[PDB]
Amino acid sequence: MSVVGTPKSAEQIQQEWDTNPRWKDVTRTYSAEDVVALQGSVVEEHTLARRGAEVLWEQLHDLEWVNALGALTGNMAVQQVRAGLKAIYLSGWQVAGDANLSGHTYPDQSLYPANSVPQVVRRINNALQRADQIAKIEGDTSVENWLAPIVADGEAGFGGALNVYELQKALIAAGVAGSHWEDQLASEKKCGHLGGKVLIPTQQHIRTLTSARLAADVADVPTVVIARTDAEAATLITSDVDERDQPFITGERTREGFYRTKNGIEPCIARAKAYAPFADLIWMETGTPDLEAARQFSEAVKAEYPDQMLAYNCSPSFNWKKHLDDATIAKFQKELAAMGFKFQFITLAGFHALNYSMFDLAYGYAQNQMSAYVELQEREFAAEERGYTATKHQREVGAGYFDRIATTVDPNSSTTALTGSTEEGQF
Amino acid sequence: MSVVGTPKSAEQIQQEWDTNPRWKDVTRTYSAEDVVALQGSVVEEHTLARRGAEVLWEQLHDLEWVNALGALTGNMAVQQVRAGLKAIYLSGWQVAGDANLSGHTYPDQSLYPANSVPQVVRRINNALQRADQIAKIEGDTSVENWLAPIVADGEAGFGGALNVYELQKALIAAGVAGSHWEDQLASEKKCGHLGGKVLIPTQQHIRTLTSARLAADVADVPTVVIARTDAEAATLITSDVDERDQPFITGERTREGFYRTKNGIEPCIARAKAYAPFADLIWMETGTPDLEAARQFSEAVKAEYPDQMLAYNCSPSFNWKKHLDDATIAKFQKELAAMGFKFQFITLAGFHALNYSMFDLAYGYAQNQMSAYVELQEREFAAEERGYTATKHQREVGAGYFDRIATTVDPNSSTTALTGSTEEGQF
Amino acid sequence: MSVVGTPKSAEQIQQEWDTNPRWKDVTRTYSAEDVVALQGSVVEEHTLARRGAEVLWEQLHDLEWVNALGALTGNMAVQQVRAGLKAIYLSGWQVAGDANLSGHTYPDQSLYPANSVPQVVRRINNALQRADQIAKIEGDTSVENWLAPIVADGEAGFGGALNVYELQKALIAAGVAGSHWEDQLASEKKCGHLGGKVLIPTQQHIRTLTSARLAADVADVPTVVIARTDAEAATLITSDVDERDQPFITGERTREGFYRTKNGIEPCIARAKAYAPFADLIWMETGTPDLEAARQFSEAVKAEYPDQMLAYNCSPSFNWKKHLDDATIAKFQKELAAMGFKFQFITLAGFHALNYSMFDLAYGYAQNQMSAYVELQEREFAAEERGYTATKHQREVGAGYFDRIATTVDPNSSTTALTGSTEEGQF
Amino acid sequence: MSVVGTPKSAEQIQQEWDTNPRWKDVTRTYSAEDVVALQGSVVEEHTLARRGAEVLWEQLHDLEWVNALGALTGNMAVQQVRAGLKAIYLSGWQVAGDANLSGHTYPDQSLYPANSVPQVVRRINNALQRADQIAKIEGDTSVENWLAPIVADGEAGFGGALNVYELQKALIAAGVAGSHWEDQLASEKKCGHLGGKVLIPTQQHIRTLTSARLAADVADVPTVVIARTDAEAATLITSDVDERDQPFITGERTREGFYRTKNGIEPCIARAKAYAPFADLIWMETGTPDLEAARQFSEAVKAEYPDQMLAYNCSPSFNWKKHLDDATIAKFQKELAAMGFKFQFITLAGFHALNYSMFDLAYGYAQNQMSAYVELQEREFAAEERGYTATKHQREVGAGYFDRIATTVDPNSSTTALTGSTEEGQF
Ligand SMILES: O=C(O)[C@H]1O[C@H]1C(=O)O
Ligand SMILES: O=C(O)[C@H]1O[C@H]1C(=O)O
Ligand SMILES: O=C(O)[C@H]1O[C@H]1C(=O)O
Ligand SMILES: O=C(O)[C@H]1O[C@H]1C(=O)O
Ligand SMILES: [Mg+2]
Ligand SMILES: [Mg+2]
Ligand SMILES: [Mg+2]
Ligand SMILES: [Mg+2]
Ligand SMILES: [Mg+2]
Ligand SMILES: [Mg+2]
Ligand SMILES: [Mg+2]
Ligand SMILES: [Mg+2]
Known part of the structure; x- marks a missing residue:
């Protein structure tokens, strides 16, 4: 053929x-x-997944560290890149709360349809591609790489090793650069900072990591694979079958048949060493933002795997100033990077930026109407000297790019959009 | 049977x-x-469409005026109601730019799939229903009506009278309270503040408004029907067949076969009068925020239809402080309401709040890392005095509500979420 | 308010x-x-869920039995009702194979997105509603109830009790009349006639049935709830924690941690009795079509619960003539109905009708081109004698109904569809 | 970088x-x-669109002709290829009636969301890829090319040149090989064999074809572009602006502003010649299956463009045997091929095979229960002589393929599917 x-x-x-x-x-x-x-x-070629995974891998070795914010809409990711960030974090928590294919608001418990995160990967890539297209016709060279790598949440795989496979394959089709996978029981999955967590056996998570590598190999792309352990806080596990887990098993049960297990940094270090041959980065969920606990994890893992890169969740679930003073806050990511935490991310940044900015605007609008909106518009005009462009909202979503398509098809068209617009006249 | x-x-x-x-x-x-x-x-009952339309109609007569902000995510609408707003505006522009079923970023030209706005209507209602569910189990009575009426954008109907009918039907199935329909040619639709607009004959828009009312009647709900005219700026019309449009026709035709027409407030007033028997509210797009021009339109329409209610777009496409001083901005909506503009809305409020807030956060994060995020979290904590609740993000998306479902099914469950969480421990 | x-x-x-x-x-x-x-x-009203569940409950008591065929498209369900069937069966197997929201072809292992079956429930109800609308304007009273009740596949719930709750809620929102739930581990779900099945403890399935009933109560509809057991063939179970399951536990263990268990009719009868207080119907999967075995199961369950109705899968996974003579096949459903099997269904009837009919057509087309299609068209003409109407395909999909909408909006419209069609001129 | x-x-x-x-x-x-x-x-690589378009172009030059049947599900396309067909036809009519993203049954009037055909393109390609994967592990060499080229319906573009552009881009992203575009007004689109058709000016359709070629060039794939004319039956046109259309105008105008126009083969020949520099194939809709009318059209076009390939709709909207005898039906496609109609297709084959086969099964089931299904199963066993494989439905949808994934991940898995199945035991 x-x-x-x-x-x-x-x-x-x-x-x-x-x-x-x-x-x-x-x-x-x-x-x-x-x-x-x-x-x-x-074999279908997956251009954005290949490029993104290659760029991410090189950045992890060239930059002091790679940091990111959670993004739940395409426009969110566009602003992250315009402001200088070099990777995008795709939070499953955020998808559950405000961006999943059921249309419902959910807590972070693997309740939404399993193709939701892939659809948001594809959306973010589409939005970045449009920003790139607009920059090219505008001669804007201010951003070096609009197609920043996307690291996306695989949660606990929504089932067995075959569900993991299919999710990894869908993330790749959508253009993901990396994906992370946690050692929780899918049917009882939780946000790392919620209670009621149930671990699966060490070997079962190795099976998950193997299946995610297998799907990437079959799709012929070098996807970055991240292993996450929830053993710092989880006090339940599904079974005692794995000899590596038995040192922490107390012998207590639950009515559901779970085994009680002793939590903390020790099973985290043990699990991380077991996962290391099967993961490009390893991530330990923690209960507080603690540079000393992060050091103990890093040093124990690198004692056996000196070159193993790590990742760290700078979580909004922490009350930061109840734990740390301003000077430690300011050095936090830099110190983590020196310990080998090369990918660092604020998971719920998009949820909090979106919810706070609309409450703040709507509250002022309810009290003083247009005066409250004008205050926002003026902050936007002021941000242009920092590189902000969305004040001109028509060109920001591609009115000029589609004008170019229109005049390419018919240079005499009477119905193009930007000429005669109030954006041209008043901005 | x-x-x-x-x-x-x-x-x-x-x-x-x-x-x-x-x-x-x-x-x-x-x-x-x-x-x-x-x-x-x-006949399927459409509970939220019925309730929303009934509440909206009563508010339009009981309140001095009803105002709203554009919402493109479910969380956005939740914050608008939490902050005291009594209606939600669903912008087609924002759906094109950041929330439509193609997954692409589009300018405001009816490019996205025609069921996109109904899907966002359903999403917003789901998110308000969750906020209402949470408030009930928390005993929170601070919001009297979580299910604020949604007014949604029907654009130019995405085709002919049958496309209008199906879009209205889908909006109702999703729970819309009101919908608006504009007299543009759907194949060349523009944002009202973009150039290149083509009107359709007066009688063709009466057909559109009749089709929208018919769909609501067949669905057995009293949907609020809003007619929008784009004749202030449009200089083209598809045909000269309608005698009511012939005074403004200059006789000149374009190579596409369009007729050139004289734009301004006069064709707007003529079309508004023709639409008035077919619309619950009438809306004129304008090129500037001008209280004197709004009065001229209002008084001309009310000279023949004294009880006709009007709607007004307080558009972010205007540069507000370039046109108006601070005192006029402060009184702007109050003055319009006295003229009969009983529904007023900021179309692109959500786009600008979302894009600005993420740019500002990401820019600071690129420079100062965790310091920039803590500034936002601290502002969130301070906003709790004003009624903001999303700092406790787990309960905000229903962690406590789903805990209640879990304990209703199995009071002895070992895997509930909020007990043991960092939110319970630190917030 | x-x-x-x-x-x-x-x-x-x-x-x-x-x-x-x-x-x-x-x-x-x-x-x-x-x-x-x-x-x-x-509380949103769910008209089709309420009517369908009420009609199904009455039918299960008034008819000798209720039988159905699996439907995976809307037109499939329309033909089933036109042909005289009084319920529709919605197979998850068929959804996995050819009608799920991932777009992929899957085997029957809970691989597809969890909102897939709700979407097909809504589609089937939409298709029956159109057939009802067309019949009304045509004066066709040959079908007494176009809105036949839909019984849909909830599989193993796609996770824990909360995933069950949300699936049931979504099935109800889409208009389901009944739903069924099986005692398999969701992460290892299988078609009942596949190998590798893993059971969950008896009490865990009671939790699932309780969650399904709770979602229906919160949605205020009397949904028919069906409990299925896979214990006839399954030789694995996740845990020995439930004393009702311990009699069949062999003590042997797999590397994954599963427990081997003794399969057969005995654990099915035990589980059926435990599920009976929580299920409107009980369904035991079997390995052969065997009236003796069905009688043994029915008598053992009715010895404790004489009024308990049962359901039976007349599965295409059986080689029917390999097991039964033509006389037994002819009386098979009637004999089951006398034992209390009041809902009987051929799960994969749609898959086999669709796949065989297109292979047959395309094979003949490949050899003889139009002669093969004309043979189908002549068989369709011949079927109008049994009430078949889809030969007139334009009216079948609603061309005359949308013509009536168009002429209600504008009785003088020049662009209606059926007038001047080849269907009007040649059929 | x-x-x-x-x-x-x-x-x-x-x-x-x-x-x-x-x-x-x-x-x-x-x-x-x-x-x-x-x-x-x-630039994203579009593997399936490139390979499909390349295979289609070579087949159109190598084979005596290329013929196809309408497919609306993935399994349908698999059976067409298994039976020996070399291309898939994706009918917009069928998508309207039973496979579109609104969930509703629609007549053929461009009522459904504009991304519906791209979604079915992706689905068909997914289904063909699965059959290919299964064939490889089974050692099945009986089908040379599972990834047969898909020719898909672009209707009238769902709006203006920019809607055309976006639909072509989406079809390519989904893996289409060719697309067709018709010279009807999108807001009044009809099936070619319905009444009420409105033409657009000749130059407007050249714009459509130019936009479709532009989208393919920007996506860097050699998509086959097909131009369809509806001038044989249409008696209305939107405008008389184009001098190539003016010979057929009468001067009269309808109340909506449409121009009346003289229909027949003469305007079809005129429009075909104007479209030929912008189309890889040209298609004239006809009112009857008439070999001499096809020869008149083909000879007129080829007199000016000798190498211009043509396409022909062998439409089920014709009552074939009331127009032609059996001998002419049998030679119909072969005679058309000799005239230059190199792509020939039965648009509604899938709708009719699906609706008839389920009606026939369900009618027999209503009377005779299991005897009617056993008749179908026995016809399936008999068709295995001809190459039918779907009687073994578990392997047909990939149970063997996913077994292979599972044992690649974990060779000792206890939970593979085919071992212990009734398919392995009774088939
Ligand atoms: O930061 C958080 O608490 C949420 O992102 C989710 C997680 O950590 O699992
Ligand atoms: O305010 C705006 O400019 C955008 O809402 C769109 C419109 O006015 O049509
Ligand atoms: O009848 C079958 O074999 C398929 O429907 C699936 C099941 O029984 O679980
Ligand atoms: O064959 C037909 O009648 C239908 O396919 C539609 C068309 O021709 O446009
Ligand atoms: Mg997560
Ligand atoms: Mg490693
Ligand atoms: Mg709009
Ligand atoms: Mg009025
Ligand atoms: Mg099933
Ligand atoms: Mg019972
Ligand atoms: Mg078509
Ligand atoms: Mg040509």
């Missing part, structure tokens, strides 16, 4: 695994032939 | 039209038998 | 539970006050 | 347009530089 999309040979894939530094200290318990057997006759 | 959902008889429907004050001075050019003929054997 | 959608009092709900025969021998382990506490301030 | 997805230079694009025989006699009224200006900094 065609050679478009012809799959590589097993020999070619193996040679890449053997020689490319990307795969240094990456364990695959399946074979190159196993991957080829799953690829059918044609 | 049931009486659930049995339709009314034509006589009952006619009797309501003849006697209910809601229908005073409402023209229906079809009959009550026509409505019944289209209803099949079962 | 309106009375539309006001919730009932707990006293009203309790009086209905205590005295309505619908709730005879129905156990609820939560209270009427618990239901009111979860309902917020407004 | 990556080279992944780097766009081509304008010089490279121009050299391909100038020298590649794919673009012989293809007029582009915009420039190579215009295309580059719209591509941003990264």
Whole structure:
């Protein structure tokens, strides 16, 4: 038929695994032939997932650290990149609360449809692509890379290893650069800072990490895979079958059949070492923002895996000034980066920016009507000297770009949008 | 074999039209038998559409005026109601830019899939329902009506009279309280403050308004129908067939076959009078925020229809302080209300609050990391004095409500969320 | 501030539970006050869910039995009702294979997004409503109830008790009449006639049935709830915690931590009795179509619960003539109905009709081009004698109904559809 | 900072347009530089759209003709390819009737959301990819190309040139091989065999075709572009502005402002000649299946454009045997192929096979219960001689494929599906 999309040979894939530094200290318990057997006759190219994963991997080794904020709409991600950030964090918590395919508001318990995060990945890429298109026709070189890598939340995989596989494949189709996977029971999943967490056995999470690598290999992209452990706070586990988990099992049960288990940094360090051959970064959820506890985790893991990169949640679930003074707050990310936490992110930044800014505006509007909105518009005009552009909302969503399409199709069109607009006249 | 959902008889429907004050001075050019003929054997009840439309109609007569801000996410609408607003505005522009079913960023040109605004209507109602559920279990009586009426953008109907009908039907199924319809050609639709607008004949828009009323009648709900005219700025019209449009026709035609027409307040007043028997409120798009021009329009329409209520777009496409001083800005909505503009709204409030707040946070985060986020969290804490609740984000999205479901199913559950959470421990 | 959608009092709900025969021998382990506490301030009416559940309950008592075929498209359901069937079966297997929101073809292992079956419930109700609308304007009274009740697949709930709750709520919002729930581990769900099945403890499935009943009570509809057991073939269970399951536990363990258990009719009878207070119908999956085995199950359950209705899967996963002669096949459903199997259904009837009919057509088309299609068209003409109407495909999908809408809006319209069509001129 | 997805230079694009025989006699009224200006900094690869369009173009030149049947589900397309067909036809009519994103049943009047056909394109490609994956692990070599090219319905563009552009881009993203575009007014669109059709001016449709080619060029794929004319039956046109349309105008205008126009083969030939530089295939809708009318059209177009390929709708809206005898039906497609109709398709084959097969099964089921289903199952067993495989429904939807994923992840899994299935035991 065609050679478009012809799959590589097993020999070619193996040679890449053997020689490319990307795969240094990456364990695959399946074979190159196993991957080829799953690829059918044609392999779709995933341009944005390949580019994003390559850019992310290089940034993790070139920059002092890579930091990000949670984004739940496309416009949110556009502003993060315009303001200088070099990666986007896609929070599952935020999707549950305000951006999932059921249309409902949910707490962070894997309640929403499992294709919700992939749809938001695709949306963010679409929004960044439009900003890129607009910058090109405008001659705007201020942003070097509009297509910042997206790191997205895989939660606990919404089921078994096959649900993990399908979620990873959908995230890649949408253009994700990295995805993270946590060792909780999917049916009882929680935000790391909620109670009632139930762990699964160490080997079951290795199965999840293997399945996420397998889906990326079958899709022929070098996706960044992140392992997260919830063992710092969880006091339940589903089974005592894994000998690595038994040192923490107390022998108590629950009515549901769960096993009580002893939480803290020790099972976290043990699990992280077990996950390390199967993860590009490792992340330990913590109960407080504590540089000393982060140091103990980092040093214990790197005692055995010196080159293992780590990730850290700078969570809005912490009351920051109840825990830390302003000087420690200001140095927090820089100190973490020196310990090897190379990916750092504020999970719920978008939820809090969106909810606070609308409450603040709506409250003033309820009291004083247009005066409250004008105060916001003036702050927007003032932000232009910092690089803000969305004051001109028509060009910001592509009115000029679609004007260019329109005049390319018909240079004599009587119905283009920007000429004669109030944006042209008053902005 | 049931009486659930049995339709009314034509006589009952006619009797309501003849006697209910809601229908005073409402023209229906079809009959009550026509409505019944289209209803099949079962009529679904649309509870939120019925309640919303009833509340909106009463508020339009009981309050000095009803105002609103554009909302493009569910959380946005929740904060608007929490802050004291009594209606939600659903902007088609914002849906094009950041919340439509294609996943793309679009300018305001009817480019997105035609069921996008109904999906956002349903989302907003779901989010308000969750806020109401949470308030009930928390004993929070501070908000009297969580289910604020939604007024939504029907654009130019996405085609002909049948496309209008299906869009109105879908908005009602989603729970809309009112919808607005503009006299533009759908294939060339623009934001009212963009150039290149093409009007359709006066009688064609009467057909659109009739189709919107018919869909509401067949759905058995008293939806508020709003007519918008774009004739202040539009210099093209599709045809000269309507004698009411011929005074403004110059005879010149474009190469597309459009007719050039004389724009301004005069065609607006003529079209408003023609639309008045077919609309609960009438809205003129304007190029500037000008109280004197609004009075000229109001007095001209009320000279023939003294009881006709009007709507006004307090548009972010205006540069407010370039046109008006601070005292005029402060009184702007109050003065419009005295002229009969009983529904007033800031279309793109959500776009600007969302884009500005994320730019500001991300810019600070790029420079100072955690310091910038703590400034926001501290402002959130301070806003609790004003009624803000989203600092406790877990309860805000229903963690406590779903805990109550879990303990209702199984009072001995070991996996509830709020007990043990950092929110309980630190907030 | 309106009375539309006001919730009932707990006293009203309790009086209905205590005295309505619908709730005879129905156990609820939560209270009427618990239901009111979860309902917020407004309860949406679910007309089609209410009517469908009421019609299904009456049919299960008035007809000798209720039978159905699996439907995966709206047109499929329309033809089932046109042909005289009185219920529709919505198979999750078929949704996985050809009608789910991921767009992918899946085997029956709970891989698709959890809102997929609700979306198909809504589609089927929409399609039946259109057939009803067309019949009314055509004066066609040949079908007494176009809105046949839909029984839909809730699989294993896609997680924990809260995932069950949300799926049931969404099925109800879409208009379902009944739903079924199986005692399998969601993360390892299988078609009942696949291998590798894992049971959950008896009490965990009671929790699922309680959650399904609770969602229906909060939504204020009398949804028919069906409990399915997979214990005839399953040899694994997640835990031995439940004393009712311990008699069948063999003591042997897998590497994942599962427990081997003795399968067969004995644990099915035990689980059926435990589920009976929580289910309107009970369904045991079987490995062969066997009237003797069905009699043994029915008599053992009715020995304790004489009035308990049962459901039976006449599965296409059986090779029917390999097991039964033509006389037994002919009387199979009638004999089951006399044992108390009041709901009987062919799960995969839609998959097999669709796949076989297109293979047959396309094979003949590949050889003989138009001759193959004309043979189908002539069979369709011949079927009009049994009441088939889809030969006239324009009116079948509502061309005449939308013509009636168009001429209600504008009786003098020049652009109606059926006048001048080839359907009007050639059929 | 990556080279992944780097766009081509304008010089490279121009050299391909100038020298590649794919673009012989293809007029582009915009420039190579215009295309580059719209591509941003990264161009996504569209593997399936590129491969499909390349295979379609070579098949149109290599085969005596390419024929297809309308498919509205993924399984339908799989059976068409299994049966030996080399292309899939994606009917907008069928999507309107039973497979669109509103969930409603619609007549063929551009009522459904504009992204509905792209979603079905993606679905069909997903289903063909699964059949390909299954075939590979089964060693099944009986089908040479599972990824048959998809030709999809663009209707009248759902608006203006920009709506056309976005629909073409979405079809390509989904993997389409070719798309067709008709010269009707979008707001009044009809099936070609319904009444009430309104034409747009000849130059307006050239704009549509130019926009469709532009979107394919910006997406860097050689999509096959098909132009359809509805002038055989339409008696209305929006405007007389175009001098090529003026010979058929009568001068009369309707109350809506439409011009009356003389329909027939003569305006179809005129429009085909004007469309030919902008279309890879040309299609004239006809009122009857008439081989001499097709020869008149083909000879008139090819006299001026000798190499112009044509397409023909073998429509189920024709009553075939009241127009033609069996001998003519049998040679119909072969005779058309000799005239240059190289793509021929039965638009509504899927609707009719689906509706008839379920009516036939359900009618028999209502009378005879399981005997009627067993008749179908036995017809499926008999069709295995011809290559039918879906009787084994578990492997048909990928139970064996996902078993292979599962044992690749964990070779000792206790929970694989096919082992212990009734399919393995009774089939
Ligand atoms: O920061 C948080 O608390 C939320 O992001 C969720 C998590 O940590 O799991
Ligand atoms: O305020 C605006 O300019 C945008 O809302 C859109 C409109 O006016 O049509
Ligand atoms: O009948 C079948 O085999 C399929 O419907 C699925 C099940 O039984 O679970
Ligand atoms: O074949 C048909 O009649 C329908 O496919 C629609 C069209 O022709 O436009
Ligand atoms: Mg998360
Ligand atoms: Mg590692
Ligand atoms: Mg708008
Ligand atoms: Mg009025
Ligand atoms: Mg099932
Ligand atoms: Mg019972
Ligand atoms: Mg079509
Ligand atoms: Mg050509």
